Amino acid sequence: LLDSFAVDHTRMQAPAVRTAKTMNTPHGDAITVFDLRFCIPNKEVMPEKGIHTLEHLFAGFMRDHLNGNGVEIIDISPMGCRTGFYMSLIGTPDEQRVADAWKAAMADVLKVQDQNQIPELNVYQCGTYQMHSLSEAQDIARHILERDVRVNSNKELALPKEKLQEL
Amino acid sequence: LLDSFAVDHTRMQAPAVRTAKTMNTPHGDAITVFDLRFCIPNKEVMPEKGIHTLEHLFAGFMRDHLNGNGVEIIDISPMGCRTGFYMSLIGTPDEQRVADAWKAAMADVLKVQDQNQIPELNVYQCGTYQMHSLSEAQDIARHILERDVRVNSNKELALPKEKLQELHILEH
Ligand SMILES: [Zn+2]
Ligand SMILES: [Zn+2]
DSSP, rough: OOOOBOTTTTTTOSSSSEEEEEEHHHHHHOEEEEEEOSTTTTTOOHHHHHHHHHHHHHHHHHHHOOBTTEEEEEEEEEESSSSEEEEEEEEEOHHHHHHHHHHHHHHHTTTTSSSSSSSTTEEETTTTSSSSOOOHHHHHHHHHHOOEEEEEOOOHOOOHHHHHHHH | EEEEBBOOOOOOOOOOOEEEEEOOOOOOOOOEEEEEEEOOOOOOOOOOHHHHHHHHHHHHHHHHHHTTBBEEHHHHEEESSSEEEEEEEEEOOOHHHHHHHHHHHHHHHHOOOSSSGGGGOOOOOOTTTOOHHHHHHHHHHHHHHHHHEEEEEEEHHOOOHHHHHHTTOOOO
């Protein structure tokens, strides 16, 4: 992520919410990008099909539970390392509010009955429509609820001078 | 909140730039999300390692070429279907401007010699630091330059109301 805090992924707990970046707009509004860490870095990874199916569901369900009262979601997208999603939004909700909405969204994934209920899962509306698994998406959502969602601190995970050097 | 678009992926050309969505902040700043389509839907995909390595390089290089003169990038991230990236930014640059910066960025990927020039490629800064391939990232960047980058029209790719019913009507 562009212009982010530099945090130590070997100490990063998951699942967890973290402020990856804040930004101002020209007329003074706030934009926050959240690190929604599903998996512990370099120990766990979400599978490709599940993460894609989850991507189709996550944005809507997150909007259902998070939009309004000063918050407007711009986009939720997967991380290329496959350990989480970045969520960019207008507003400055606190991390526990995001964590509660995220958990509520994972619950919603569990009630999805069939690949047929999934928004835009067809050749006309998905770039790679074969690359899907509702059961994998549900396993991921289920693991988030089993593990709960911590709040991570940028202060606690900050890389010290010594370790940045060593790189 | 201004405009988002449901477009027909069976007719979508790539590589191409397209305005996926526009939004306004409370005090009236425009936010645009661009569909940066690398691959033709359901005919090509980028590979997992190359797309990740590309992700480490793309945001910086795009900033180098696109930021300023009214534009500030928020984030560039991969699509789960692996046919492109979404780029969210502050501002309303036109699609050809984004296409030129994107091409310039792909050129930059080509001059990356070995991975030591790849930012944050280590266990302390990357979620899955073995899942990388510079040669794959360079094949992707090269393909974009070989194919060039078109501007896609939302009006042209619009799914009509009838077809969306038909598809909404196979929800639940
Ligand atoms: Zn898709
Ligand atoms: Zn990484």
